[model samples]
Target: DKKKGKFIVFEGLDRSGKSTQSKLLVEYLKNNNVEVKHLYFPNRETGIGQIISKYLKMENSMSNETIHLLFSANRWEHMNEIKSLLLKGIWVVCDRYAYSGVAYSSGALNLNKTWCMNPDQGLIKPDVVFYLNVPPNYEEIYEKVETQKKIYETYKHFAHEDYWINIDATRKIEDIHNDIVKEVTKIKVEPEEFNFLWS
Candidate 1:
């Protein structure tokens, strides 16, 4: 049987420690001698990413429709490479992903779910989505408390999805890593075909 590494994505509010947890997981995988790849969304290296970056920095502005597509496009640009990594059994640990795109935009911008999800409909689906729920959690442009609260609330709505897991980020860092390790250790069994998000 052909096997692939699990796609693991950590998502949450701005300061809820998504990056820390993602790093812990990556460190764990590395120490365990597992082939792994770490990723971050809206990768600032791409053309789309630069545009998203300026918009995030408040140096640029655009319509909701435009910004959302740009974010989606950023992910599209990486799909092929991400695909290659997993196909080689390199576990993928990502900090943020499409979920953040929809949640943040829909909540703060008052966009509908159908519209928010459409651009990401056919994107790759992770084997599991870890939602770090710090409840009490920002910096850049959209880091305003009000905007964060909206995005935080919107993230809750997706908790019921099959691939989602809400984590208590209020706990100790070591404990949190252990918890994530517990979940990650179970990521075996490959899907017959890579599944798409919200499709």
Candidate 2:
């Protein structure tokens, strides 16, 4: 049985509890025919992610290129585990992804958009990227109005990409979840080959 799972990703700005929503989605899907796993980004525990976490905490400093590439490295660092779970027919509900790597870098950091995409190229492309716009917290280096607005606009730049689904994040938690269930169910029940990021 060569069954494989879909690489599902949930992308969004900081405010929306995509972290919360991604977990709820994974939990609900676990009871079904397909096994599910939720892999969060900048895993913070990894060696690379440790630096990223420090950057987040404002305890360290990095250039635009430095931090942007580090974020991409954080994902690449987890590449093995993500692929292993999918090979086992376990759907992975991911939180944040390369798109975030690109969006936050370009929008919030004022780096070149294509330059940002380069580091993440050829990474496992997500099967479906739920672009959540509900859209932070006490505040951080990148959690301001100007930054989020630019980030939001950057995300919208690809609103029509075939693999992405623009999810309305303003709805109730369950309402948003039910919609995700519908979308993921459609994908889970169907498949073939696979696609890579920005390719």
Q: Which number leads on TM-score?
A: 1
- Name model 2 segments beyond 4 Å from true: 1-3, 135-139, 188-191
lDDT of 1 by residue, 1-199 (tens): 2338788999998889888899989989899998888999878866789898888888887888899889889888888888888778877888888999899889888889788898888888889999999774433777878888888889987888878988999999999999999988787666446888885
Candidate 1 wrong stretches, greater than 4 Å: 1-3, 137-139, 189-191
Evaluate model 1: give its lDDT: 0.85
lDDT of each: 0.85, 0.83
Give the C-alpha miss distance for residue 135 in model 1, angstroms: 1.1
Return the clash pairs for model 2, or none: 15-136
lDDT of 2: 0.83
How well does each candidate superpose onto the true structure, as a TM-score?
0.94, 0.92
Clashes per model (N, Cα, C within 3 A): 0, 1
